[PDB]
Design an enzyme around this catalytic site. Sequence first.
Site, short mmCIF file in Angstrom:
data_model
loop_
_atom_site.label_atom_id
_atom_site.label_comp_id
_atom_site.label_asym_id
_atom_site.label_seq_id
_atom_site.Cartn_x
_atom_site.Cartn_y
_atom_site.Cartn_z
CG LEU A 76 -1.74 -1.38 1.51
CD1 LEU A 76 -2.49 -1.06 2.25
CD2 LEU A 76 -2.87 -0.75 0.42
CE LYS A 90 3.75 7.60 7.54
NZ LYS A 90 2.99 6.71 8.23
CG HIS A 186 -5.11 1.13 3.72
ND1 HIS A 186 -6.78 -0.28 4.62
CD2 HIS A 186 -5.48 1.87 4.88
CE1 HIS A 186 -6.65 0.23 5.82
NE2 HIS A 186 -5.58 1.17 6.13
CG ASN A 214 -0.17 -1.03 6.42
OD1 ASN A 214 -1.16 -1.03 5.75
ND2 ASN A 214 -0.18 -0.82 7.62
N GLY A 215 2.76 0.14 3.53
CA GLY A 215 4.14 0.83 2.67
C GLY A 215 5.09 0.49 3.69
CE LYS A 375 0.78 2.07 10.48
NZ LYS A 375 0.43 1.94 9.42
O1 LIG Z 1 -6.32 5.57 1.53
C1 LIG Z 1 -5.91 5.22 1.09
C2 LIG Z 1 -4.99 5.42 3.35
C3 LIG Z 1 -4.14 4.75 3.43
N1 LIG Z 1 -3.60 3.92 2.07
C4 LIG Z 1 -2.12 3.15 2.40
O2 LIG Z 1 -2.52 1.84 4.03
C5 LIG Z 1 -0.97 2.17 4.59
C6 LIG Z 1 -2.23 1.42 5.79
O3 LIG Z 1 -2.29 3.09 6.28
P1 LIG Z 1 -2.42 4.35 7.68
O4 LIG Z 1 -3.22 5.37 7.34
O5 LIG Z 1 -0.95 4.36 8.08
O6 LIG Z 1 -2.81 2.61 9.13
P2 LIG Z 1 -4.05 2.99 9.64
O7 LIG Z 1 -4.70 2.65 8.17
O8 LIG Z 1 -4.54 3.92 9.96
O9 LIG Z 1 -4.18 1.49 10.02
C7 LIG Z 1 -4.28 0.33 8.80
O10 LIG Z 1 -2.41 -0.26 9.93
C8 LIG Z 1 -2.37 -0.75 11.18
C9 LIG Z 1 -1.37 -1.65 11.91
O11 LIG Z 1 -0.17 -0.54 11.18
C10 LIG Z 1 -3.50 -1.47 10.99
O12 LIG Z 1 -3.85 -1.70 12.95
C11 LIG Z 1 -5.09 -1.08 10.58
O13 LIG Z 1 -6.01 -2.25 11.50
C12 LIG Z 1 -5.08 -0.78 9.38
O14 LIG Z 1 -6.08 -0.02 8.96
C13 LIG Z 1 0.16 2.95 4.90
O15 LIG Z 1 1.32 2.05 3.42
C14 LIG Z 1 -1.14 3.86 3.65
O16 LIG Z 1 -0.47 4.91 2.99
C15 LIG Z 1 -3.35 3.72 1.38
O17 LIG Z 1 -2.80 3.23 0.18
N2 LIG Z 1 -4.57 4.31 0.42
#
Ligand SMILES: O=c1ccn([C@@H]2O[C@H](COP(=O)(O)OP(=O)(O)O[C@H]3O[C@H](CO)[C@@H](O)[C@H](O)[C@H]3O)[C@@H](O)[C@H]2O)c(=O)[nH]1
Length: 483
Positions: A76, A90, A186, A214-215, A375
């Site tokens: 992601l 990021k 996501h 996650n990226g 984060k």
């Molecule tokens: O519209 C979006 C939003 C996020 N991202 C990517 O999704 C990843 C996760 O997003 P992030 O906002 O960092 O995390 P959260 O969505 O708050 O949490 C996710 O990641 C956590 C672990 O770090 C888990 O505990 C949660 O369940 C999960 O939804 C990252 O690579 C983001 O860049 C996308 O590609 N598109």
Amino acid sequence: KSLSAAAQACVKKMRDAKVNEACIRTFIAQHVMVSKGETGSIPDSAIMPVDSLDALDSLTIECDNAVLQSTVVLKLNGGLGTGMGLCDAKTLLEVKDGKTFLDFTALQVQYLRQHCSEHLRFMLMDSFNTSASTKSFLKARYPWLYQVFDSEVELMQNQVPKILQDTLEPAAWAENPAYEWAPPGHGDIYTALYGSGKLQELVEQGYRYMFVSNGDNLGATIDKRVLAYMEKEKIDFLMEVCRRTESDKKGGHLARQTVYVKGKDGQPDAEKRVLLLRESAQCPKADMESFQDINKYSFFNTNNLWIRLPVLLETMQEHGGTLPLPVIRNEKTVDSSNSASPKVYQLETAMGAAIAMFESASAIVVPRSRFAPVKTCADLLALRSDAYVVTDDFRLVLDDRCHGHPPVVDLDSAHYKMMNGFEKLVQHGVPSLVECKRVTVKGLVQFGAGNVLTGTVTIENTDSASAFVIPDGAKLNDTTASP
Ligand SMILES: O=c1ccn([C@@H]2O[C@H](COP(=O)(O)OP(=O)(O)O[C@H]3O[C@H](CO)[C@@H](O)[C@H](O)[C@H]3O)[C@@H](O)[C@H]2O)c(=O)[nH]1
Ligand SMILES: [Mg+2]
């Protein structure tokens, strides 16, 4: 066909903008939910703890070669890191001297291609915000990924309209109409895969699994044991969860409900566990006590997810060409910068919520080594520090000296919340944290160049009209250091 005026106004705006129909169907179903009072809230009383899962350390058997070759890896990369004051991807941040998240990501892919499956398919889900910079980075640094970037790597997430809290109509913003649109979280991965045709293309090409992470998590890579477990146990979706620590505050936890298996032949009483994800945003806000209790809800989603692709595809096809993930109703203003701009809902979904969408879905407990989230700037502090080491396969994992416990980092959010503030804090070097259980920075402060922190260490500047600079070489062991 039967929609509210506000819902129809969304359809029209989305069709006018040529938004793919799968995204329109998905969004509108959420919109309907929202118009009936849905917020995505999951109260404590509606769920129960999960107290039994298999752990990955209990597995040994690796998948067959066919299965391996059928697995795609996706990272992601669509979000903004707005809490860290970032405007770009990021993953372009440096994690170790001269190496970014993208570097380690690309190196992991190359390692896997050299030692496991020479043609391993690698994808990035980007948004309009992150696409260009990502593509640019790969062109300079990893030409072999750049050459197939458009053709096979990039999956573009959708954008959906921000809707006024007033009427649920699409928000307009004359000064900057790009702010009328938002990325849908996501969870959009499934919709973007399906609506783009890429999901069906992958299944056509013989791909059967996808591993997504996650990226910002460089601990996550394919483990061939998971694939053998999914094959044996006929599991179509698998969430990796970690035992929750006090630092696990931004994200979601696993929960259950109980349903009652088909019919009542044999006995009524019998019931099946159903799993679900509760994101922080889904906890009622006056009851965050439920959410933040790491004993009660001790399985924290890593967002390392395994999906069986043909099953995803058939499930979406048989559900109107969508995956009906629970909506999360985010509240913002249409210019998030300007709290005098109109208030909006931004409807989003979380990809881990897909654990509720498949009969065979499960979760597995993994070691912390598969979960190194970044984060906040405090996370990034730990990652950059010698607390984290680089494995031969290019994951970032805690040093063995940490015993699986990341240093706890509590940086003053008046000074270090933003990447500009954090970077001033580590201007002259990043402190050794390998032996630090807990570092706390209070008021304005600046690390020196030789620093080593052991045990529990508070650095407190009460003054902060003046920056408290730590002498070079300094060593702080179970101590509060102040000016
Ligand atoms: O519209 C979006 C939003 C996020 N991202 C990517 O999704 C990843 C996760 O997003 P992030 O906002 O960092 O995390 P959260 O969505 O708050 O949490 C996710 O990641 C956590 C672990 O770090 C888990 O505990 C949660 O369940 C999960 O939804 C990252 O690579 C983001 O860049 C996308 O590609 N598109
Ligand atoms: Mg994000």
